[PDB]
Amino acid sequence: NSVYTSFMKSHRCYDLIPTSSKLVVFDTSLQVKKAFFALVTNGVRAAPLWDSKKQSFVGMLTITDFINILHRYYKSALVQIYELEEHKIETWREVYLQDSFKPLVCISPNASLFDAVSSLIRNKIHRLPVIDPESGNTLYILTHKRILKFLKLFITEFPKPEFMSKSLEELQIGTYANIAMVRTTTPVYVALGIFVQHRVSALPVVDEKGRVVDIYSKFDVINLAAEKTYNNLDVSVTKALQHRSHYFEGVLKCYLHETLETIINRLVEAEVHRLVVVDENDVVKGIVSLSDILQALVLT
Amino acid sequence: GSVKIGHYILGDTLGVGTFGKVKVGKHELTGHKVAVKILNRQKIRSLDVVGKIRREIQNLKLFRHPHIIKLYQVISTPSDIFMVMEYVSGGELFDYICKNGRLDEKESRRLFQQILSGVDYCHRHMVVHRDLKPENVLLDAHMNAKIADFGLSNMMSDGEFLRTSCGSPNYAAPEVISGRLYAGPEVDIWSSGVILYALLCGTLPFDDDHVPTLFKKICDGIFYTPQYLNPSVISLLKHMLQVDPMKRATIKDIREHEWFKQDLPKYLFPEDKAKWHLGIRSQSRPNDIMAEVCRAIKQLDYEWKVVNPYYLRVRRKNPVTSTYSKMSLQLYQVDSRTYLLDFRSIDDELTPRPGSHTIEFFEMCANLIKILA
Amino acid sequence: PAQARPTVFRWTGGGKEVYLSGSFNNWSKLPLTRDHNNFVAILDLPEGEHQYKFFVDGQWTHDPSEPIVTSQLGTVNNIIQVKKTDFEVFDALMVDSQHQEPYVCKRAPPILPPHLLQVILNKDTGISCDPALLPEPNHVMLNHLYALSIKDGVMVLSATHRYKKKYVTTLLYKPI
Numbered sequence A: 001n002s003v004y005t006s007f008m009k010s011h012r013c014y015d016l017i018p019t020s021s022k023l024v025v026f027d028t029s030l031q032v033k034k035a036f037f038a039l040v041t042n043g044v045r046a047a048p049l050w051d052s053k054k055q056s057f058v059g060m061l062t063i064t065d066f067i068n069i070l071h072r073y074y075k076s077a078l079v080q081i082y083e084l085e086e087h088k089i090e091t092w093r094e095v096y097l098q099d100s101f102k103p104l105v106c107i108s109p110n111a112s113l114f115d116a117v118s119s120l121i122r123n124k125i126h127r128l129p130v131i132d133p134e135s136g137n138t139l140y141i142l143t144h145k146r147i148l149k150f151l152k153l154f155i156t157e158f159p160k161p162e163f164m165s166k167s168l169e170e171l172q173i174g175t176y177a178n179i180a181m182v183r184t185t186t187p188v189y190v191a192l193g194i195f196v197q198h199r200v201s202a203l204p205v206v207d208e209k210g211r212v213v214d215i216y217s218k219f220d221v222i223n224l225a226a227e228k229t230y231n232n233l234d235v236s237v238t239k240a241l242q243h244r245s246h247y248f249e250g251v252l253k254c255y256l257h258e259t260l261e262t263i264i265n266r267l268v269e270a271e272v273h274r275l276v277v278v279d280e281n282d283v284v285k286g287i288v289s290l291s292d293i294l295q296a297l298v299l300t
Numbered sequence B: 001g002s003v004k005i006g007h008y009i010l011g012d013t014l015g016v017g018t019f020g021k022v023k024v025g026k027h028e029l030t031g032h033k034v035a036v037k038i039l040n041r042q043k044i045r046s047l048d049v050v051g052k053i054r055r056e057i058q059n060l061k062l063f064r065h066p067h068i069i070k071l072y073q074v075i076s077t078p079s080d081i082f083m084v085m086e087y088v089s090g091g092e093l094f095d096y097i098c099k100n101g102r103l104d105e106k107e108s109r110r111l112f113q114q115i116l117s118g119v120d121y122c123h124r125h126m127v128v129h130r131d132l133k134p135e136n137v138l139l140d141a142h143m144n145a146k147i148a149d150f151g152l153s154n155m156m157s158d159g160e161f162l163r164t165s166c167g168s169p170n171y172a173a174p175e176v177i178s179g180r181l182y183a184g185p186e187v188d189i190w191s192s193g194v195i196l197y198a199l200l201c202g203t204l205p206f207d208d209d210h211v212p213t214l215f216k217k218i219c220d221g222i223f224y225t226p227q228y229l230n231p232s233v234i235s236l237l238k239h240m241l242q243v244d245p246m247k248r249a250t251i252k253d254i255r256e257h258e259w260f261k262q263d264l265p266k267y268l269f270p271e272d273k274a275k276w277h278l279g280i281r282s283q284s285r286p287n288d289i290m291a292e293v294c295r296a297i298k299q300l301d302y303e304w305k306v307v308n309p310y311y312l313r314v315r316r317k318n319p320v321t322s323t324y325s326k327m328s329l330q331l332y333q334v335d336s337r338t339y340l341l342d343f344r345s346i347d348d349e350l351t352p353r354p355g356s357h358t359i360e361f362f363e364m365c366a367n368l369i370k371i372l373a
Numbered sequence C: 001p002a003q004a005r006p007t008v009f010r011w012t013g014g015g016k017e018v019y020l021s022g023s024f025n026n027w028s029k030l031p032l033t034r035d036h037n038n039f040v041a042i043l044d045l046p047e048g049e050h051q052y053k054f055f056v057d058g059q060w061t062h063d064p065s066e067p068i069v070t071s072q073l074g075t076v077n078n079i080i081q082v083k084k085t086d087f088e089v090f091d092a093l094m095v096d097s098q099h100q101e102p103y104v105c106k107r108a109p110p111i112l113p114p115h116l117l118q119v120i121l122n123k124d125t126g127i128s129c130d131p132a133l134l135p136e137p138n139h140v141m142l143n144h145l146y147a148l149s150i151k152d153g154v155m156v157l158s159a160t161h162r163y164k165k166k167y168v169t170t171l172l173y174k175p176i
């Protein structure tokens, strides 16, 4: 039981649920294109799926689903993607999940944070819906970002274990091998394929030298639905990232000799899901995600 | 022998209420004074308010506030119910203003802070007094305000409005004397504004010997502001006495007001694109649209009961879940030529049920709306 | 304990002197205190039957509005039974309070209260906060159905409910 593990066991999910929040829900019979447009309209990255037939929550619709659909059925900028236009969430769920046999992963508001973090790690998902066992009503959608940000405020008051002081190199936190990356000229379609194969949240965008000049995130993919440019995937990732260009600070990066607490204080501050570990020359040495940090704090 | 209940010797009558009187009482040993409210059980049966009396006793007994009259004990006898409360010797705030006249700006604020502190405490606890007036505001020896009569008070329920008109016409909000629906914390603020005016000017903002004239004055929201009034508190009065409920000040708004914040004790307040629309609208006649709904309710094989011509309670059995989902249908009037059907979900007290209560409420409405649209 | 149960004896009417005689006091004369036209004494009585009579201005009488018993000797006394439900407030109030859903074919509509015209989803929030978060709803707005005008063959319904001290506004996208 780490000083952190005790805290994660004690508090419930209810403690994280904001005073007033919005929750979007999709019926599985809804057209899939409209569902993705709805995610853009309400500013929501994921929604619970409701089957009107069996009267139960079957699953979640995320941006990853938008990525899977695009990569699978994309042909050319000359021809429309019919499936995205013709399909319903139910229909595509059949095709994608035929051999998968996936259930809905949820959690009770009375369950602890240790249970929530464990559930996120075990199933390797970024979205954990909170459902009241009594009313059967989905309450809130729990993420890594909120959980870690929750803890940081509490962490400050309490004694800091030597864990926080140790560097990243000696703590061995994050993935330093076989990093999924794209060039600046890499087409969006190619990037989508890398998303599907490697199943990672973001792709660092690098130059010929290998230095990271930008980052392509699964979140940046949703801008295709926002501007309805999703029908042209032949463009590079650089031209696709010009939409956020008005305000772009730079690619957030951390080094190997960096202390753990410095990193957490950085991620919570900028509210991003990962950091790019690089050598001094900006060459990418690896990635530190939010799921990476939590998995470390949930173990002893 | 004397008249004695719970070791208290019952004295003179302090006042009367719609049933049973309020008598002072004195402890045989200590000499401690209490105010005992005697409720005749046969009289509360005559008016069929038994639910209320049971409800008011439940809520008030939990109340602990300096400026709200405390309920010490409720003693039950075969014939009567005795409510033992705290006794304040200052009597009515009303009688105090009659004798001593208006209060200076300092004392008016001191009392108004104490009164609004109590009004807030009630609203936090989902209780609306709505009898508020100097007659129901008492005083102790130290001139501390005490809220007294909860007989006309009511409980605030989620998604519910109160049609009942309570209180004296002078202290009643324009929506009350007009007989319209209200949420009820905004009704207590209007009354609190009149009390504040009464403290400052020693007179009532709205009064007339001609009742129709009085009701027009209230609905017009026009009252005389004496020349000696601080223009700061005039702005506060103008805000609390707003005719439009939506433009009327809230307790948050009053606490932010500069005149109210002055010399405020710390103890008084505990530390603190697509266009949506409500329900479905129809320009058809009330009995025609009401007829339409009933046909459609049947078409979906729903069962309903008529509580009121425009108020229906509909219940449906989900085929898959085998349980039931209840909802309420209420028709309102948006304009002369327009009417609105309102959908409201009903909480089930049943054991945990498969599915989602919120969604099944939506699906139940969806079927009906699809027909009506 | 349960052997002392407060019981109100009240004689309604006028008199110079009103007394209470009963089986409880051994038929002695207990002077009643009077307020206007009411004469009252409060006594602790055990559980059981008690018979009593009134002495009013030199005349032995009984209360006609109260239960009575007649003996074989022709004596008419008032009778009262002290019981458990009388002395518990909520027990007493429960006895003092003393449905067809099936459908059958079948004054102006109440003016729409302005409170329901506050739409939590129409309200705009700061660009500096989380898009999922919302303002604190009025309790009176809860459970009421709000909707979007049907477009593209898709209907959107929404309602704000409450979980403990927290509120959740749920949006449902369903096709027509």
Ligand SMILES: Cc1ccc(Oc2nc3cc(-c4ccc5c(ccn5C)c4)c(Cl)cc3[nH]2)cc1C(=O)NO
Residues within 6 Å of the ligand: B003, B010, B011, B016, B017, B018, B019, B020, B021, B023, B038, B039, B040, B043, B080, C008, C010, C033, C034, C035, C038, C039, C040, C042
């Ligand atoms: C009109 C009316 C008629 C009857 C009524 O019921 C009762 N009045 C009561 C008075 C008394 C009472 C209390 C103390 C007394 C007296 C005498 C000396 N003292 C010191 C009478 C009692 Cl212990 C029970 C009562 N129940 C209530 C009302 C009513 O609604 N308010 O008057």
Ligand SMILES: Nc1ncnc2c1ncn2[C@@H]1O[C@H](COP(=O)(O)O)[C@@H](O)[C@H]1O
Residues within 6 Å of the ligand: A058, A059, A060, A061, A062, A063, A064, A065, A102, A103, A104, A105, A106, A124, A125, A126, A127, A128, A129
């Ligand atoms: N709680 C959940 N239950 C079932 N499937 C999920 C859940 N969360 C995410 N998924 C699915 O997991 C895949 C990737 O999720 P994400 O990592 O959130 O993009 C998508 O196919 C989602 O629909």
Ligand SMILES: Nc1ncnc2c1ncn2[C@@H]1O[C@H](COP(=O)(O)O)[C@@H](O)[C@H]1O
Residues within 6 Å of the ligand: A126, A174, A175, A178, A179, A180, A181, A199, A200, A201, A202, A203, A204, A273, A274, A287, A288, A289, A290, A291, A292
């Ligand atoms: N670009 C990347 N290449 C390889 N692995 C990654 C990359 N980004 C994240 N990961 C790893 O994927 C796992 C989940 O992280 P995330 O997908 O960011 O929630 C962690 O083990 C990360 O270290």
Ligand SMILES: Nc1ncnc2c1ncn2[C@@H]1O[C@H](COP(=O)(O)O)[C@@H](O)[C@H]1O
Residues within 6 Å of the ligand: A201, A202, A215, A216, A217, A218, A219, A220, A244, A250, A251, A252, A253, A271, A272, A273, A274, A275, A276
């Ligand atoms: N390390 C980083 N440096 C710069 N931008 C980032 C970084 N991580 C995420 N972002 C951006 O933050 C936004 C949301 O990222 P996320 O929600 O973490 O996938 C997207 O615009 C990303 O490109």
